[PDB]
Each structure stands twice: as structure tokens, then as C-alpha cells.
Subunit: 92 residues, 6 copies
């Protein structure tokens, strides 16, 4: 009960701050959907290019799944940074 009071640096948040944080998280939800769509596109592209050594080598050299993972991580950590700017913890 009231676990946030037990975590160092966590202060009480107004409803306004909570709403802004939840807004960040909902925009992140939309980004989650978009990333899933891109991953599906990559599956389909690779599949359709099966037994096309040149196209398969092109895709493998571009490393699109690795770049999608990088982008996902950047989106999530940017979300976390914005939420930190809103919530403003009391600790380093």
C-alpha cells in the first residue's frame, strides 16, 4: 500500500503530473503498434525474397531487425526521460 512512499526519491504526484505521464505512455503505445507493423513488414519482405540470394544478402547486410530494435530502445528511453522530467524524482 502506497509503495511509492517506500522508494527513495519518489515524491507525491499531482493528478496533472500523472495525466502527463500517462499521456507519454499512451503515445508510446501507438509507437509499439507502429513497431509491430514494421516488424511484420520485415517478416513479409524476407519471406517474399526467399530463394533470391541477392535480395536476401541485401536485407542481411542492411540489418533492419537490429535497427528496429535500436529504434525501439531509443523510443522507450526517451519516454522514460520525458516521464522523469514530469515526475521529477528527488534522487540522483
Amino acid at each position: 500500500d502506497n509503495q511509492h512512499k517506500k522508494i527513495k526519491g519518489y515524491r507525491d504526484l499531482s493528478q496533472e503530473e500523472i495525466d502527463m505521464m500517462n499521456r507519454v505512455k499512451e503515445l508510446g503505445s501507438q509507437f509499439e503498434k507502429l513497431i509491430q507493423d514494421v516488424s511484420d513488414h520485415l517478416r513479409g519482405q524476407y519471406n517474399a525474397s526467399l530463394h533470391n540470394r541477392d535480395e536476401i544478402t541485401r536485407i542481411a547486410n542492411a540489418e533492419p531487425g537490429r535497427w528496429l530494435a535500436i529504434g525501439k530502445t531509443d523510443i522507450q528511453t526517451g519516454m522514460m526521460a520525458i516521464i522523469r522530467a514530469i515526475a521529477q524524482p528527488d534522487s540522483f
Copy 2:
């Protein structure tokens, strides 16, 4: 004219790929609006806490504007990574 053909590694893009890229960029637009809103909130919070040395010191110690900048950069570079996964350049 057709400048993309003059840049190393840039290949021709299908309309599908262009649409996915533009989708990433529009979601980024919404994030731009959200970040502007958070910055306005920070302006108002600081202003309202003028001549409240304790609250001013708290805000300054939390560094919310620096964290908002960090989050903005992360969102933008994640956008760039996702767009790279879609467009798949031909170069390192």
C-alpha cells in the same frame, strides 16, 4: 532532380516504404506536440514557484529541462533508427 540517386547507399523506395517512413514521422510530430506541452508545464511550474527558494532548489536539482532534452533526442534518434529499418540504406 532525383537527389536521392546522388547520395551513396540510398536506393529507390516503394510507395509502401515511403508511407511507413511518413507514418514514423507523423507519430514523431505528435511527440513534438507533447514535448512542447511538457516544456510549457515546466515554465509554469518554475514561474509559480518563484520566491519559494525550497521549491526552486528542488526543481533545479531535478533538472527537468535537461531530462526533457534527453527524452527529445532519444525520441528523434529512435525515429531515425526505425526509418532506417524501413528504408534500408546500402551503406555502413
Copy 3:
């Protein structure tokens, strides 16, 4: 009251998870002290090298305050990542 229940993706945490999170944050406190010490060292180094154009140019070219800021940000975001691994939010 119980603000964590109002934030999307935040689940109830056991006392064990809270303790691990607080541990991350206390180690971060020690890092805060170390970074303050390094910043003091940089102040003193610059001051002692006043009116020594060569040493001043060397320091300015090395950009140690910018690198200290980079390191601080990395430590803080790594702390945030570890705390996320512990708390395991329910959202993207």
C-alpha cells in the same frame, strides 16, 4: 493516495523488488558524490592553470566538463534501466 495504481503499466511491487530498486538508487548516490568530487577537481585544475595559456588550451580541448556530464547521464540512465528490469512495468 496509491498514485502508482493510477499510472499506466505500474504494477504492485513486493518488498524485495522495492529493496533492490532502493539499492540501485543508493549506489547511484555514491556515484553522485564521486561526480561532485571530480567536478571539484576540474574547478581546481582550471583555477591552478589560470594564466598558463598552454594548459588552459589543453583543458579546453579535452572538454572534461562535457565528458563528466556525459558520464553522469549514462550512470543515471543505466540506473533507470536496472530499476526497470527489477520493477518490470506492464507497458511499452
Copy 4:
């Protein structure tokens, strides 16, 4: 012998600078221990939640091992940035 004189940009370091660098590295050691502890916790959590499809899916969706790896990398690169601020190499 004296390999640091053979590496571009590496200058001679005072004992004070070496001590500060070693301090950064020892704090990093403590972080290494903490990360090992968190990884053990994750092993135990997953194991205890074996044959609990809902809890297993929750953990898998949270990706805590990936976030622990992200945090480890951030801690290490922040350490490297702080050590660079101390040692101040002579090269880009």
C-alpha cells in the same frame, strides 16, 4: 614497457588522477555485484513462475534481461566518460 607513451593522445597521469580513475572503477565493481544480484533474481523469478503461462508471458513481455543488459552498458559507458574527464586524453 610504458605502453601508454605509445598510444596517441595518452599523456602522463599524476597519482591523484590515477586514484580518481581507480575510484570510478571500484564503484563500477560494486555495480557489477548489484547487476549479478539482479540477474540471479531474474533467474529465480522465471524459475518460480515455470508452468504459470500468465506470469511467464508477463515476464517475457517486460523483457527484464534486455533492460538489465541496457543498464549494464549505460553504467560502463558512463564510467568510461567519467574516467575520460579525469584522464583527459590529447586526441579527438
Copy 5:
């Protein structure tokens, strides 16, 4: 045809800007070669240290392939940032 006009925020580029971008990309090519060389060195080091449990454990603990991957990603995203500074898109 003229796909860049269909992507949000992409403006027309002068030949000067295109040349600077291509310069960034060619320097990146040289970095690609250097990273391949380092990876070959790591293969050879590991191979030569086969059936030397101590050296194998040392290498595994240092995680040099993971650090090479980190460095590759940093080089590529720095390239992307510089190219963005040159091309200056019109969108967030």
C-alpha cells in the same frame, strides 16, 4: 521518381550538401573496414587461445565482440547525426 519530395520534412539539397553527406558516408566506409579488421583479430585471438581455459575465460569476461558491436552502432548513429546536421530536415 523524386522520392525525396514525397517524404515529410525532406527538402531539396544543394550539390554542396550532397557532397558533405557522401563524405560522411565514405569515412564511415573506412570505419567499416576497420571494424571488420578488428572482428578478424578477435576471431584469430579466440582461435589461438583454444584449449587455454584461462585465456578463454579472460576473453569471454571482456566481451570484446559485444563492445565491437556497441562501437559500430555508435559510429553509425554519429554518422546519421552529422548527416542530419548537414541535410537539416524540416520535421521533428
Copy 6:
């Protein structure tokens, strides 16, 4: 004298490893030159667009100097990661 033996985790390096590290650093030197060139281009672009409120606002909105700084930091930390993969320190 032999300061590297006094820093935790630093092992003795072969001449091969030193040469690879110095190679990374020389490529970084070339990147330093390229970044200086881009910064000069940005100075000239801004200057030439003086008293052209529209072009000045465009440049300011694109934030090219901030993106150049981001790219510089990424190049430098990628260099550091590659050099770490080569030198392979003995510490976290």
C-alpha cells in the same frame, strides 16, 4: 613510470593491439577534421542567411549545431568502444 600497471583492469598490450588502437584514433582524427568542416559550413550558412528571417527560423528549427554535437559524441564513444574491444580491460 608504467602508469598503466597502476590502473585497475589495465593489462599489458602487445604492439599489435597498440597499433589497432592507434588506427582507431587516427580515423577519429579524420572525423575531427570532417566535423570542423561541417561546423564551418554551418557558420557560413547562418551568416549568409542573416536578415532572412525565414531561412534563419528554418536553420534554428533544424538545430544543426546540436545535431553536429550529438554526432561528434557518438563518433567518440564508438571509438572508445572499439578501442575497448581491442584492449580488453580486466574490469567491469
